[PDB]
Each structure stands twice: as C-alpha cells, then as structure tokens.
Design an enzyme around this catalytic site. Structure first.
Site, short mmCIF file in Angstrom:
data_model
loop_
_atom_site.label_atom_id
_atom_site.label_comp_id
_atom_site.label_asym_id
_atom_site.label_seq_id
_atom_site.Cartn_x
_atom_site.Cartn_y
_atom_site.Cartn_z
N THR A 1 -31.14 47.68 -18.23
CA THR A 1 -30.08 47.61 -19.23
C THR A 1 -30.09 48.76 -20.24
OG1 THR A 1 -31.45 46.08 -20.52
CG2 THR A 1 -29.78 45.12 -19.07
N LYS B 1 -12.25 51.45 -25.31
CA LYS B 1 -12.75 50.09 -25.45
C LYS B 1 -12.52 49.55 -26.86
CE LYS B 1 -16.06 50.42 -21.66
NZ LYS B 1 -15.86 51.87 -21.41
N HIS C 1 -14.55 45.78 -23.69
CA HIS C 1 -15.21 46.22 -22.46
C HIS C 1 -14.64 45.41 -21.30
CE1 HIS C 1 -17.86 47.69 -19.55
NE2 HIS C 1 -19.00 47.70 -20.21
N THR D 1 -22.02 49.18 -28.37
CA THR D 1 -23.37 48.69 -28.59
C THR D 1 -24.17 49.72 -29.37
OG1 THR D 1 -24.29 49.63 -26.57
CG2 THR D 1 -23.25 47.43 -26.40
N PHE E 1 -25.13 48.73 -15.85
CA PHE E 1 -26.43 48.13 -15.60
C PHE E 1 -27.12 48.79 -14.41
CE2 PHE E 1 -25.78 43.59 -17.47
CZ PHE E 1 -25.86 44.13 -18.73
N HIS F 1 -17.49 56.38 -22.36
CA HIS F 1 -17.70 54.97 -22.06
C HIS F 1 -17.58 54.15 -23.34
CE1 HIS F 1 -18.76 51.67 -19.54
NE2 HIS F 1 -19.96 51.48 -20.08
N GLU G 1 -25.16 57.80 -25.10
CA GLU G 1 -24.02 58.51 -24.53
C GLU G 1 -23.63 59.72 -25.38
OE1 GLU G 1 -20.40 56.25 -24.15
OE2 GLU G 1 -19.45 57.89 -23.01
N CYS H 1 -20.14 47.78 -14.50
CA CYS H 1 -19.27 48.54 -15.40
C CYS H 1 -18.78 49.86 -14.79
CB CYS H 1 -19.98 48.83 -16.73
SG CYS H 1 -21.09 47.52 -17.32
#
Lengths: 408, 408
Positions: free
Chosen positions: A270, A329, A334, A305, A394, A301, A312, A164
């Site tokens: 993750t 996004k 994404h 999720t 990730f 970002h 963040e 990402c």
C-alpha cells in the site's frame, strides 16, 4: 511500429456523461461528492462521503436479456463503450467482428451483488443464491467479457483489472496491441461501481477523509489540510485506432498515444515509493522519445492521501521540474478502476480546449509536497502539445501515459 | 526482436509437487479426483467431486508476517514461484530487483475467505470482518502483487486473471514482454484455490460430472460417456528469460517459447465456438512461423463437458489435422486459473522426456469429436520437437501456446 490515435471517447461520471456537461461543472467549481446517509447503518465505517453516479442514460435496447450477465459496473462499462464507439463512427461496423478489433478493460472488482451471492454459500451453506450468471457478474473481468459478447468482438481480450491502474493499464496495453500490429482497433478503459464495502477497504487503512459535515471541501489533493480520499464510481472509455486506418476513413482524431510506461515498486502493498513512481514517468518519456521539457501538463493521480500525494509530487518534481499539474479526483473522488480512463479522457479534452482544470479545494499547497506548478482556483489556458497522465495502485503498480495533439 | 526460453519450472498439484512424482502417478494411472464428504453440507450442490491438493511443502521463512497478505491461492503461487526461481538459478539474484524482471500471473478469483469478509458488510452490516489485508487477499491479482512484494520485483506487473486462461495468458504476455525487449526475466503462471462455491458456479450451468460414486472414472475428456467437468486446485509457474541472457550464464533451457495466439469468440459467454478456437491456433502458428505439419503433439484443454470437447476437438482437427492429443484434466480435473500453467509445465516435461501421457478414463472416443490421434491406455513415445498447448475460458477467451525443444 504503428502509430496509434484516439478516435472516440466517452465517460460516465458524477458530473455528467458528456465532456461539455462535465466542463460546465468544472467551471462552476462543484464536485460530485456528497454525504451518504445510506452509510450510517455501518457503524465501524468512519467515512460517510462518496461520489456516486446518481443517474445515467441507459438505451432501451439494453433489455433484460442483453443485461443478464451485467451488474452495475459492467452495464456502465458497456453503455459507455457504445457511446465511444458511436463517437468514433464504428458502432455496428464490420471491423468490430473482423478479429482486428479487441478490448482492454478492468475494474477493481466485479458486481458486489454477485460477490454477495458467491459468498452466501460459504456462510448460509446454501447454493440457492448462486445462479447461471453469478460468476459472469462477479468476476473482475466482467466488463471486458460483457463487451466482447455485446459488440461481437473477435480480437484480443486484455483484462487489466489492477485496482486503481485498471483503466490506465487498459489504455497502455491497448496502445501496445495496436503499436505492435496485433490489432487495428481497441476499446480501452476502466470502470467501478460504488459500494460501502469498497469504502471500507480504504477506511481500515485510515486513508479516508473524515470531513463528513463538509462534503463540499473534500478531498483536497496536495492541500496542507487534506485528511484522506473519498471514493467514487463511473466509467471511462477511449477508442484507439491504428493511424493509417483512421486517416484512410477520414476519422476525427482527438489525440495520438505516443508513450506508455509501467513498473512496480517492489516494496509494499500500500505504501508507494517515490523513486519507482519517477522511474515509471521516465519509462514513458523514453517510449515517447520526448524529454521532460516537452511535457506541457501532468494529470496527477492525486488521491488526497497523506503519503500518496507526497510521494507522487516529489517524484513528478524530480523527473519533470516545475510543471503545471492538477488532480481531477478533487471533483470525482477516487473512482478506482475508472480513474485512469476518466482522467485520460478529460485530459485530452483539456488539451483540445487549451484549458486546464485546477485542483478543486487546493487552497494552501502542502510544504511537504514537491515543487510543482499547481493549477489552483481557476482554469489555466495553455498551448499544450503533449500531456502526461499518471496513476499508481496497490501493489506498487505504476502507469504513465503520454498523449500528443493532432492537427487535422 | 528477442528469443524467449524457459529456464525454470514448478507446480503444486493433486499428484505431487515435482515432475518426477507427478509422472510416477501418471504411469500408475491414478487421478487426484476424490469424493468430497465435506460438500455434503451443500444440499443443492449436485456434484460431490473435486481434485484438492491435500498437502504441499511450505518453507519455514513463509511465516505469519510474510504471509499476512496471502490467502491459500496466493501462498501456493508464491511458494511455487520460489521453487521455479530456485530451479532457474535466479532466487535472490540481482536481476530480480533491477527493473528488468517482472511477473505475469492470474487466477479466477482471490481467496474465498477474504471474499467472505468483504461480503460480511454486504450481508450482515457487521464490519468486524474487513481488515487491512481483506482486499489484498480477495483481489483477483493477489498472486501477482504478493509476488512483486515478496521477491522485490520492480519490472512489469501483468495481471492476467481471465478465469480458465489465467495461466496461459500469463505465459503468453510474459513471453511478449521479453520478445519485445521490455523485460529480460519474467515469472509467469496461474493458480487457483479450491472452494465449493467454485464448483457451484459450474454446477448451476449443468457442466459438472455427477458420477459421485465413481471418482476414479471421472472426468472423461473426449469420451462417449463423459458427463461434465470436475474442478481441482493448484499452481504452475514458468521462469521465462531472454535467450542471450540465459545462454551467457550457461542456464539449462527446458524449452523455447516460439508462439502465442489469443482471440475471442465474441458470441457466447459460456459455450465456446469451434471456428474462433481454430483461428486462435492459427494465430499461434503464424506467430511461430511454423505450419500445422510441424506440431508433434497438442495438449488439449479438454474439460470433459459435452459441447466443449466437441468444439475444441473439431477445431483442432480442422486447423491442425490428425495430431496426437491428450487432456491432463483427466488427472487433475479442471484447475481453473492454474490449468494453463500446469499444463504448459507438464507438456514441456513430456517433450523433454519424449513421453506423452494418455487421457485417463478415455475408453470410447466420442464419434462426434474431431478426428485426432487420441493417446489412450499407455503413454506414447514421440520424438517431438514442437508442441502446442491450448486453453479456452469463459467469455470465449482463447489462448494457444507453442513451445520448441532446445538441444544444448
């Protein structure tokens, strides 16, 4: 130390291939997300939403011979890069073959078709599907290599395939290559092609949205009713250039790159760590010699999720305070390897328009997210001189980029 | 600007896992190449040769929980890196989690088992094969991410997956990160796991040796009767450290990294161009502020292909003149992502031993190859103070590394 400017920009998205077209869809408030009937045939896959690019212009000179080593992700990349070079006035320029021009580019993976060829040997015990271009098309640096061959670049190849953060890491490493005097021009960006297997890797983590019957109201970054991400595809590209070189040829300058920070969570493959995300923003601020007060807007970002949005926003709030922030996004989903480059491109456009796009489908700000000046409902007019764009991937890989307005 | 030294080194090869064991096999003239009966099942695959690692030591603490995100390539990488950190005296050291320590690492591909799981959806629609670690194990930066998580690294993650230059590009980028003050310690190297599909990628290019009945006579870099490469697997790792930091703690210093050049052919995706290979060596010399006369020994890429060995040796002769040179791919085969790191490691050992290994099976020097001092038959004793190690990959990506002896 050299100063570094942006002289060309392009992207290919589910909302269009020009910033004018994309901003017209931003104002209309429509996302690129849709239900995927073609994914019903995958029974274990719970998500059925994606943000595909249904069409994009492919110039006629991208013929059969030129594109033999290109899958979808590499073709989208090189066509995008050509548009950015054309924008910069550098298409066919002598500097491209001089050794002073290079490329930084990445994707989460190569072409899934070519991945299938390579895997067909371990399954079907047969080499018949592997051919002379299988590796070139499948390998995670397929975009960067196809670009150096197609444009004849003889400088640095910087493969920044890091899931990402591919496209933001590309911009940062390209910036450094020019800042430290190694190159004068860099193609920088990221791309990703869409595949149901790509959705599967997030679906098995229970990170995808389930709202298959409401594609128009998901994903919902920082929203109290968000239920995961939706993946998309596309490409984004910036042309970075040494400042005196750009000024000497009278080039139009879209922005100046003044800071890049990158670090690593060092904890989990993750699950992001708020503290290290915030440290990455501090690295960028220090690299730019600016303070939190000088940042006018943050492009998050903001994957939609649960714990991603919390980590963040808490880190951003800790480091930057009550800052205007939004996530694109919500419009594209994404786009994985492409996202950092698409988000940097369109954030520079917001700065040059003085118009900053809200997070689509952000209706109730989650109480568990950080105190931020979330742009909601309608675009916000701001006299922004410095912006920040953040991405996290990730392996806990963090990037933070700082861009500054240029008056000419 | 900082100086950069090597304080730890390790590798896993078909000739052993310590420098002493490997050099004993060098002296005996025994390669790791063998016939592969297990590849007879792939009928279209012409080459039946490889250099597999039959065994390497795996410490007890690498249990199933610790290794659940590692395929073979990532496990070899992390085990190798732990050994290198132990060698440097930095295993478990406070600096590793300080933010001042990072990783540069790459491979041509992730784990082929994980690539197969990912392609189960592409081919059989059955999703019972993708799991929560499929992408972590398949992705081309699987080694780097697994290392930051395992060792708790909070500094830079630099994914340098660039096929045959992965490990050398990792050393160069790690060196620049320390030279420019971004990091004080870096784990740097490359790795590859063996797969028949990997051999098939070169087989379909008619680049592989067909001397299946004479594994002890192939490959033959620079030899008049060479007929292509043989692939191998393994891992190599250097611990790079800022010079004052190393000296302040009394660390043993194996070498100083004094130069890194990288550039791109910009013309062909598989067939290297001699002129740009030479320019890459010139970039490294300039970075190191040394002249051709100062290079005592060159560790060739030397894959044993027809056109590759000619282009490389002609470039070396043109830019460096008449220099001692040998290729370690004559012992390991072409170890792909690992090769630049394994070759840097063992070349530094040659320098520290004053003993430089001949190219195995180089019996008739091809008159079409460049006019160099090819070390043959027996090792050459040299009082070598500066050495160069070169690697060239698909996409015409070139790297050149210069190392300098350190007397303590």
């Amino acid at each position: 130390m050299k100063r570094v400017v942006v002289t060309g920009m392009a992207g290919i998205t589910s909302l269009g291939e020009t910033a004018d077209d994309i901003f017209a869809r931003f104002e209309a408030g429509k996302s690129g997300i849709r239900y995927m009937p073609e994914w019903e045939q995958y029974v274990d896959l719970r998500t059925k939403l994606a943000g595909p690019v249904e069409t994009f212009h492919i110039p006629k000179h991208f013929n059969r011979k030129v594109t033999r080593g290109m899958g979808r992700v590499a073709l989208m990349s090189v066509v995008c890069a050509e548009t950015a070079l054309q924008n910069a006035g550098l298409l066919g320029h002598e500097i491209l073959s001089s050794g002073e021009a290079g490329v930084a580019f990445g994707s989460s993976a190569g072409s899934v078709d070519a991945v299938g060829e390579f895997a067909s040997m371990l399954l079907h015990q047969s080499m018949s599907k592997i051919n002379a271009t299988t590796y070139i098309r499948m390998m995670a640096h397929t975009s960067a290599v196809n670009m150096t061959v197609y444009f004849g670049l003889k400088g640095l190849t910087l493969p920044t395939s890091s899931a990402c953060t591919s496209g933001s890491m590309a911009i940062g490493q390209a910036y450094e290559a020019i800042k430290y005097g190694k190159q004068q021009v860099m193609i920088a960006g990221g791309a990703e092609e869409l595949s149901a297997a790509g959705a599967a890797v997030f679906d098995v983590l229970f990170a995808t949205s389930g709202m298959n019957d409401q594609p128009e109201k998901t994903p919902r970054p920082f929203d109290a009713k968000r239920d995961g991400l939706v993946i998309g595809e596309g490409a984004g590209c910036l042309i970075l250039e040494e400042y005196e070189h750009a000024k000497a040829r009278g080039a139009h300058i879209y922005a100046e790159v003044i800071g890049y920070g990158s670090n690593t969570d060092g904890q989990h493959v993750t699950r992001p760590e708020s503290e290290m995300m915030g440290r990455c923003m501090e690295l960028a601020l220090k690299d730019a010699s600016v303070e939190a007060k000088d940042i006018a807007y943050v492009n998050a970002h903001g994957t939609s999720t649960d714990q991603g949005d919390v980590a963040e926003s808490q880190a951003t709030a800790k480091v930057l305070g009550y800052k205007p922030i939004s996530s694109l996004k919500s419009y594209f989903g994404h786009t994985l390897g492409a996202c950092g480059a698409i988000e940097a491109w369109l954030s520079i456009e917001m700065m040059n328009r003085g118009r900053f796009i809200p997070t689509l489908n952000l209706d109730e700000i989650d109480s568990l997210c950080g105190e931020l000046d979330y742009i909601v409902q309608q675009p916000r007019n701001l006299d922004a001189d410095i912006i920040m764009s953040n991405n996290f991937a990730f392996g806990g890989i963090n990037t933070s980029l700082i861009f500054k307005r240029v008056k000419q």
